[PDB]
């Protein structure tokens, strides 16, 4: 799934970089740092509004 170092395109946030992955794979929680001013945001994967790249 996803991995740090992947960017995301968030439907509110826009466009941001993984910087950690955890949990398991079945339910994994992403860290997504969005560009200033919005920082890093955590999210469960499962049903995120984002799309790789």
């Known amino acids: ?3 740090v170092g992947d960017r995301a395109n968030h439907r509110k946030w826009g466009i941001g970089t993984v910087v950690s992955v955890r949990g398991g794979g079945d339910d994994q929680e992403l860290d997504i740092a969005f560009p200033s001013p919005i920082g890093i945001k955590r999210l469960l994967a499962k049903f ?6």
């Open 1 to 3: 799934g996803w991995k």
């Open 48 to 53: 995120a509004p984002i799309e790789k790249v």
